[PDB]
């Protein structure tokens, strides 16, 4: 038996119903788990500063949860709790409402010359806010699971932060993971998921990857030995490679791993094939598909690289049932 998951995003009452459309179909393909990214795109009751009526309401949200439940789909909301506080020249809700919590105050206007802004990982107000959002979203969905993001954190320990300047980037990162863990797991008893790229040494030859996005080039990877190992690592690599050497890196470290793909058809294939080289390790959980080129959630069950490959793994969950007549 295997985890088969799909990553979808939702930010409006519409995009939610689009997803609802595809849940029945996506189930029949074989999806049994839905990672649902929300960010700050829910009408928050718990913080009025981050609320706008033009995003997902409590009603639409309780329907996705309703539908996942009827279809026995493990639902896991995601809020990115450190990096990805902006995209291109739009800064997201938290940092425009709380500019004091920016890790790089006063530096990159309109986000020129950086990938994405990040929150200050040392400022306690961040955790006060984030913990409040994690509690609300896990409530409206009636779930005990949370994905905290933590991918592609390039801005951390920056000189501009009065709070983090000069500090060790890996310890700051491990500090973020461990604060989130203390709330989601220690206090709430949830299961917590995260992206794994910051835990990998890019320069390492067995576990490293080419770029500076799929693996760490800013020295955060030592945090892998400073965080609790019941955290589920979502390990994403979207290029066709003959070896995805970070799967066994995470596995031997004690983590449960969820390999993650995007586009490529073969690239997807190759990840799945290499992940299945460890099929008989239970900490090799399964697989997650992404369709980042799909911005609506319409025909998500038609995502081509998934529909082909999914039976690939569906077989381990077939369950011979025997004639009832």
Residue 120, interface with Zn ion (CB under 5 A)?
yes
Residue 107, interface with Zn ion (CB under 5 A)?
no
CA 203 to chain centre: 24
d(CA 169, CA 219): 7
Shortest distance, position 15 Cβ to Zn ion, whole Å: 32
- The SS3 of residue 231 is coil
Shortest distance, position 127 Cβ to Zn ion, whole Å: 12
d(CA 170, CA 241): 27
Which C-beta is closer to Zn ion: that of 149 or that of 286?
Answer: 149
Instruction: Quickly list DSSP for 61-97.
Output: HHHHHHHHHHTT-EEEEE---SS-SEETTEE-HHHHH
Which listed residue (65, 164, 270, 306) binds Zn ion by CB under 5 A? 164
Shortest distance, position 160 Cβ to Zn ion, whole Å: 9
Which C-beta is closer to Zn ion: that of 174 or that of 285?
Answer: 174
Q: Is the dihedral of CA 292, 48, 156, 185 positive or negative?
A: negative
Which listed residue (20, 97, 160, 163) binds Zn ion by CB under 5 A? 163
Which C-beta is closer to Zn ion: that of 121 or that of 275?
Answer: 121
- The SS3 of residue 20 is helix
List the one residue out of 223, 278, 10, 45 whose CA is nearest residue 139.
45
d(CA 67, CA 286): 22
d(CA 95, CA 131): 16
Which C-beta is closer to Zn ion: that of 20 or that of 107?
Answer: 107
Candidate ranges 43-51, 119-127, 186-194, 251-259; the one touching Zn ion (CB under 5 A): 119-127
Which C-beta is closer to Zn ion: that of 125 or that of 279?
Answer: 125
Shortest distance, position 156 Cβ to Zn ion, whole Å: 7
User: 17, 57 in Cβ contact below 8 A?
Assistant: no
Dihedral of CA atoms 239, 241, 243, 245 in degrees, nearest 10, equals -20
Shortest distance, position 155 Cβ to Zn ion, whole Å: 9
Residue 161, interface with Zn ion (CB under 5 A)?
yes
List the one residue out of 216, 223, 146, 140 whose CA is nearest residue 181.
146
Candidate ranges 68-76, 156-164, 280-288, 314-322; the one touching Zn ion (CB under 5 A): 156-164
Per-residue binder mask for Zn ion (CB under 5 A), 86-105, x = binder: -----------------x--
Shortest distance, position 2 Cβ to Zn ion, whole Å: 40
- The SS3 of residue 268 is helix
Shortest distance, position 16 Cβ to Zn ion, whole Å: 34
Candidate ranges 29-37, 113-121, 210-218, 253-261; the one touching Zn ion (CB under 5 A): 113-121
Footprint of Zn ion on this chain (CB under 5 A)? 103, 120, 122, 161, 163-164
């Amino acid at each position: 038996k295997f985890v088969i998951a799909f990553h979808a995003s939702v930010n409006t009452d519409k995009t939610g119903k689009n997803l609802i459309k595809e849940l029945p179909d996506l189930q029949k393909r074989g999806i049994n788990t839905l990672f649902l990214e929300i960010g700050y795109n829910y009408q928050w009751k718990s913080d009025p500063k981050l609320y706008n009526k033009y995003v997902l309401s409590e009603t639409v949200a309780r329907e996705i949860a309703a539908e996942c439940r009827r279809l026995s789909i493990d639902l896991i909301p995601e809020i990115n709790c450190l990096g990805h506080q902006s995209w291109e020249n739009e800064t997201f809700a938290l940092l425009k409402a709380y500019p004091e919590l920016d890790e790089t105050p006063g530096l990159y206007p309109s986000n020129k010359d950086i990938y994405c802004r990040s929150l200050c990982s040392s400022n306690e107000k961040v955790y006060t806010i984030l913990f409040g959002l994690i509690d609300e979203i896990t409530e409206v969905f009636s779930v005990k699971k949370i994905h905290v993001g933590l991918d592609e954190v390039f801005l951390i320990g920056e000189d501009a932060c009065p709070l983090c300047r000069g500090k060790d980037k890996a310890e700051l990162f491990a500090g973020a993971v461990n604060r989130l863990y203390d709330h989601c797991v220690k206090k709430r008893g949830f299961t917590m998921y995260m992206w794994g790229d910051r835990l990998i040494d890019s320069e390492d030859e067995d576990s490293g990857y080419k770029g500076e996005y799929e693996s760490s080039c800013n020295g955060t990877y030592p945090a892998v030995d400073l965080i609790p190992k019941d955290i589920i690592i979502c390990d994403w690599h979207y290029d066709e490679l003959e070896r995805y050497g970070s799967i066994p890196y995470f596995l031997n470290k004690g983590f449960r791993v969820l390999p993650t793909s995007f586009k490529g058809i073969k690239a997807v294939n190759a990840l799945i094939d290499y992940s299945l080289l460890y099929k008989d390790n239970p900490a090799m959980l399964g697989h997650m598909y992404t369709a980042w080129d799909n911005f609506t959630n319409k025909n998500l069950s038609r995502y081509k690289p998934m529909v082909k490959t999914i039976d690939k793994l569906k077989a381990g969950n077939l369950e011979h049932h025997h004639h009832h007549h």
